[PDB]
Symmetry: C3
Subunit: 365 residues, 3 copies
């Protein structure tokens, strides 16, 4: 079952007593089945109260989703600087080569952040450049020679070394409340007017769910609804399935969906594979990842309340077709004659069966 990437397929990149950065194994190294996702990496950021991920940039477009907690994200341009109070569900594009720092502004809650990384230099590779200084090396500024650094800052190497250059004091570091109220001054939040913003964080739940009943909530921000997603051609969704309910059988017309379990337990069934069909079932636990190719229909059972974040690749003109229920049921759109031909049952047998499930998108399981 290559569609399930268990939590254990994440590699720890950086860990200390303040936080970790985890990178999911290359999709296409798991299976050549996913060669179309070779240039799609996924990372978890997690950090304790009053911590900071020091100024970093990477050669990759990042789509951040705040899974849980409260953060300050500061994004640096050459000449400007902007910082945002992020919350659960705040989503933002950080373009390749943008210097960002991320602080857990909360006194108690951990901060968890999912990252879709879309590299720019080499398919599927992340090179990051640290301003800070580690034990495996100091600041990338160390890369320049003495003559370059002296010429460039107009300052003796001695002073630059003292002031700029020289593992709990590394990458993710403790930060004072004093330092956090200072970072958090004049920090814009997401709005409803921000669901469409070109540069600012937008919230998945800031617009109404595309599907909603007593059994679940599907939220989806598409390229149509937000420009940060236009060039990359990505949608981001939050699917909340209640305890003992299911996401009804459905396929994306063209989107390939990378689904991460934020929280809750559940299971999924995916139909794939001249040729016969084939079930792919697995239990889903927090931090597990499910890849759903286009046209491959899927159902998701929840045991506990189950919250999923999905990135859709090939978003523009995606149609999600359901196979049971009322709204968006592509089967009940087959005309009377073809229903009779398609299926062993009569048209009247099929039509009565399709009225049984009175719910749409989600139902009791």
């Amino acid at each position: 079952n290559p569609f399930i990437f268990k939590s254990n397929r994440f590699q720890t990149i950086y860990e200390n007593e303040n936080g970790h950065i985890r990178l999911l194994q290359r999709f296409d190294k798991r299976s050549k089945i996913f060669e179309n996702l070779q240039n799609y990496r996924l990372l978890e950021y997690k950090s304790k109260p009053h911590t900071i991920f020091l100024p970093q940039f990477t050669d990759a477009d990042f789509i951040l989703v705040v899974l849980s907690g409260k953060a300050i994200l500061t994004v640096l341009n050459s000449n400007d600087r902007n910082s945002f109070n992020l919350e659960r569900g705040d989503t933002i594009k950080l373009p390749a080569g943008t210097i960002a720092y991320l602080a857990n502004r909360d006194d108690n809650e951990d901060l968890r952040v999912l990252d879709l990384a879309i590299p720019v230099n080499r398919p599927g590779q992340l090179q990051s450049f640290l301003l800070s200084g580690t034990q495996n090396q100091p600041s990338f500024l160390s890369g320049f020679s003495k003559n370059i650094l002296e010429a460039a800052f107009n300052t003796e190497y001695e002073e630059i070394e003292k002031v700029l250059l020289e593992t709990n004091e590394d990458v993710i570091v403790k930060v004072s409340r004093e330092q956090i109220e200072e970072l958090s001054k004049n920090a814009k939040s997401s709005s409803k007017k921000s669901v469409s913003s070109e540069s600012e964080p937008f919230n998945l739940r800031s617009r109404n769910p595309i599907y909603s009943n007593k059994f679940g909530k599907f939220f989806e921000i598409t390229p149509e609804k937000n420009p940060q997603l236009q060039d990359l051609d990505i949608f981001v969704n939050s699917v909340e399935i209640k305890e003992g309910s299911l996401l009804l059988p459905n396929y994306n017309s063209r989107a390939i969906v990378i689904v991460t379990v934020n929280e809750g337990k559940g299971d999924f069934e995916l139909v794939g594979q001249t040729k016969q069909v084939q079930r792919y079932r697995a239990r889903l636990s927090p931090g597990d990842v499910l890849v759903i190719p286009a046209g491959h229909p899927v159902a998701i059972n929840a045991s506990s309340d189950l919250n999923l974040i999905g990135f859709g690749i090939n978003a523009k003109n995606n149609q999600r077709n359901f196979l049971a229920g009322e709204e968006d049921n592509v089967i009940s759109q087959i005309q009377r004659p073809v229903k009779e031909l398609a299926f062993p049952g009569s048209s009247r047998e099929v039509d009565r069966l399709l009225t049984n499930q009175k719910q749409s998108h989600f139902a009791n399981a």
Copy 2:
């Protein structure tokens, strides 16, 4: 000669007494020369009168062109349906994962459809999902367990098995009455226009770009139809009469997948090292691939109907090397004719004026 694909090289995918589905061998498997075509597939559909291809969806955009016959193509979205009267020449973009069925509605004429497919999940791969399932291979819904199907459909498994899951399969006969039902409010290709966002459009509904007593060239481009912009593809119909030739020409940018719809002919394609001629005889079902800037000439030994699919169509320029209209050689300024050519400005201009015909001439 890696540019000719013989009918021979369309593997048969499904066959029964009501029709055929055949798939051209991947272009990149015939030759690494076609690396950039690795994500394009070609299918022929052939059904008998009073037949249907049963509802299925594929993980690939389809460009369908009716080579021969009359059809009701029905097209399903999640919450809506549209169906279409397809006549010869009719062309429509069937997006990936869109459930379609295709009915032969002629009493007498076989239905023949050409499909350029562009996969979405893997370079070159068609994963198709059939609701009807073919006796040995069952409905894609069988993939779900009794638990999921019971909860989903809110129905005991026994009824789901009897109604949805458990002659002939895939391509099956239909009645007069069922063609009537399918024909209800089925929409036709406009007769003056080719600019429809979703309705089928006919290759011959706008004047051919080139036209004389020797040939006709019809071409719909991304600039002329919105369904061809995202995929960046032109569709064309070239009609060369017995004993005429499509005059030597090359496309600036576009790689053309040319399929012999009807008739017999010859191509010469100029390739690469010093230049090499690539000659082959053309028969129906044969496919010719014309890389960008690769000059081609096509002679018809009988009335020839070619159907082209041009990859990288936006800003494509087709330059002719002989004749009056679109002769790029004639655009060379006088002094660079003296220089470029053994002959003089005057004898070059002279030689160039000898073919008064444009685009097509006598062979």
Copy 3:
């Protein structure tokens, strides 16, 4: 050092006493760390006064920059022709399959033209088609048989052989003052506050340089400024560093830049990985090529006046961040408290050091 391509690495394609054509080796054949540049080739054309590169076309989009000299460029579509007076700095796009020919119209100066080619048929493969029937190099019209030739031109074969079909006489050939005077008539020139041309040539120096001071000029044309660069997502630039000056440490957010040394000598330091950071340092000489991957900081030191021509792949929304000097210094943007936490210096000592370099973009070395 993969980032440095010496003149050596140019293969000669054609050469007579009239001129040469030089094709740089495939960037991926030098190192796999350039696989994202696989479909980008680089060519130098040189030709003596009163010479002409004979009519031809290639299955590749060319972006032309006149490095040096004076030229008529004639461009053929199927039912017209447009011809251009080209000077130093004039850049133009020649779509694949477009017949051109290029005259050195000067009495004195050689013509030096740099071409970025983006193949359309196979990745990185250039197929060129020579109209020129001369001593050797037999016209591609020769590929057609006699039957098809005679029928197409409606002319007995012997006449076609004599007139069209069948050394300093072969690809670049001499042209008389008079044939240059003929070519020059209806030749149009690039504008001043040009840059906007849909099809005609535009001059790198026709709008003001983005960065400029006593130490250097940086001219840059982007898809936003010129639409010929829109669909290929390329920027073209001219960087003039004055003797004993440097281009300050800087990185491109997302552009991969192919930099040719037009004239002058200097050195570069590039900061990459192989992980920990490593310095990649090499001397620059005329005809040398530097590849700068995105987010990879570089500093360029000029020994003599140093004139560089660069092609930026992925130009749209590229941000160039400087690390020293007043303007475009991203490090300066770091909020006070993060300067404290990120660097061994106090926020105050760091702020002072960053003010020591008074110059922006280019400074004294």
